From a paper:
Noroviruses are highly contagious, infecting both humans and animals. The human norovirus capsid protruding (P) domain binds histo-blood group antigen (HBGA) co-factors for infection, and a recently discovered bat norovirus (GX) was also found to interact with HBGAs. In this study, we determined the P domain structures of four human noroviruses and one bat norovirus using X-ray crystallography to examine structural features linked to potential interspecies transmission. The principal structural difference was a variable length P2 subdomain loop (Loop A), which was located near the HBGA pocket.
The P domains of GII.9 (AY038599), GII.23 (KT290889), GII.27 (MG495077), GVIII (AJ844470), and GX (MF373609) were expressed in E.coli. The five P domains were structurally equivalent with a root mean square deviation for C-alpha atoms ranging between 0.586 Å (GII.23-GII.27) and 1.645 Å (GII.9-GX). The cross-reactivity of the P domains was determined using direct ELISA with a broad-spectrum human norovirus Nanobody (Fc-NB26) that binds to a highly conserved region on the P domain. P domains in a dose-dependent manner at concentrations less than 80 ng/mL. P domains contained most of the equivalent residues that could interact with Fc-NB26. Our cumulative data show that Fc-NB26/NB26 binds most GII genotypes, and the epitope is vulnerable and a therapeutic target region for GII noroviruses.
Residue numbers in the entry:
A (entry chain B): 224 to 346, 350 to 533
B (entry chain A): 225 to 414, 416 to 533
């Protein structure tokens, strides 16, 4: 009975739900040779968060917890980062969640800053230190589901056994950055549980539509990007509204609000992703003022106008 | 038409003056401050003000390019030409204080400058070179002139910053020795600020402003700096989208524990986009983590709040 609605925000007014940066563009590409199963940015149209998805954009790809010395290999540039829930409460692995909320959902070298503030003041006047660090999501000691990750720094000294928070910035490099490959949240001992399901276009001629952002790198060559299924602000909206999905597919039109011109139409699936009738890898050129409007509920077999 | 506040706990919301989750509610007298923040400003009917924009991750961020060192300007300082957050050129002639998201406090803003070169490398598959480094943007430096289209950034490196497209991701403060959250920088340098959102203060007897407070990381030094915002970023996004007409100048809001239905306290949400409570003194506000504000009715500035 509660009507379903979509926010009126433009592309530049929204945030990528897989990395804490503004959305740069809409983009579509063939993905049938990938397993498209992101864990951040997952919410059904009726407001059910899935995977590792939480509500605060600034906590996406962030970690909070404390450092407890080095790992077992004795590498003086690597540190054991014990992690909690984003709220500071202890993470409970017995819940069927893949990892603490906001944990990165891709294989790669997550680059950012680790900041510390000591538990006890020097007088208050607590000591602080921050340094650049890299959290490899493919390292054997990347075990967020078990409560810890390994962080590498360029300094082998100035990291203490103190409360710590990691603010993400981008990637260290993109040599092996695989946005559609999930990390092993429990290490080589990984049986990932509680995952949001993979998504895929079933109707002929359709591809997934993504909200794409290009992300910074510490060094190296490349223009890495990350594609989310729906913006963080849509997740916030669906979570609040909890409007029942009347069918499996909401028909949405991307409209120029000045002219009423429809740039294209798309299928917004109840699972929280979009498909369009387009073939090939290309950005979607739209006016900066445009946004999606909900039109009606249709079936999985509705034939969209080609883009 | 009907007015609503999002059902979000404070740990589910973002400070509108720095991109971090809200840690606590706090109230204190402000008679010794001019409370005129420029980020986190939105009226209840959805008018953004000051330097306020909608993307939390763009608060205290800059986008643009590096154009060499500053005049002088040592080898650790660089001229950061800034654009609008969406990449379009910033127009200084608008009655706006500075590019959207510019910091609204005196301090040493610490974070990372990232660069991706304009042209690819023929030897690397026509791919663009990248580099990132820690940097500090002092909002009191003579060359902090964002309204004029540029700020100065200081780095520990002297040799690995190019004249290339650049973005600044904020992390915290370098130190807090001269951090003054209620003192605006000179957006045009040593020239009055323009386009400002109005300053706010309590007026009804026994009332104080209520703040949403977050602690901020530091690069080094001693301290636990915090920043206070008037309303959360998620409330701003909500009011902006709804554009619901404010029926009076004050919405009466109650902070409720949803488990018990108990009202912990009540507050006045003013049309301008800020909250007052009937409390005297610099005090924390002890409330359950699951609590949130609920809109109850439209009242006036004469409404007498129950004390807390
Ligand atoms: Cl200067």
């Amino acid at each position: 009975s509660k009507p379903f609605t979509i926010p009126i925000l433009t592309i530049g007014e929204m945030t990528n739900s897989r990395f804490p940066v503004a959305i740069d563009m809409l983009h579509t590409s063939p993905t049938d040779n990938f397993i498209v199963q992101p864990q951040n940015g997952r919410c059904t149209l009726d407001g059910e968060l899935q995977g590792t998805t939480q509500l605060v954009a600034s906590n996406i790809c962030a970690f909070r917890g404390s450092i407890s010395g080095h790992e077992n290999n004795g590498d003086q540039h690597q540190w054991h980062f014990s992690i909690t829930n984003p709220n500071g409460t202890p993470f409970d692995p017995t819940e069927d969640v893949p990892a603490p909320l906001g944990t990165p959902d891709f294989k790669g070298q997550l680059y950012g800053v680790i900041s510390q503030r000591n538990r006890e003041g020097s007088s208050n006047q607590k000591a602080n230190r921050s340094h650049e660090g890299v959290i490899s999501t493919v390292a054997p000691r990347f075990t967020p589901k078990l409560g810890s990750v390994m962080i590498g720094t360029w300094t082998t000294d100035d990291i203490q056994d103190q409360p710590s928070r990691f603010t993400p910035v981008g990637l260290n490099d993109d040599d092996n950055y695989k946005q559609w490959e999930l990390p092993n949240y429990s290490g080589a001992l990984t049986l990932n549980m509680g995952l949001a399901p993979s998504v895929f276009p079933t109707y002929p001629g359709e591809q997934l539509l993504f909200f794409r952002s290009y992300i910074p790198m510490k060094g190296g060559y490349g223009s890495p990007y990350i594609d989310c299924l729906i913006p963080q602000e849509w997740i916030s909206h669906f979570y609040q509204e909890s409007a029942p999905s009347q069918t499996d597919v909401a028909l949405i039109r991307y409209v120029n609000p000045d002219t009423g011109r429809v740039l294209f139409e798309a299928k917004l699936h109840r699972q929280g992703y979009i498909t369009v009738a387009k073939t090939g890898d290309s950005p979607i050129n739209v006016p900066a003022n445009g946004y999606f409007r909900f039109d009606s509920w249709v079936s999985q077999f509705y034939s969209l106008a080609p883009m």
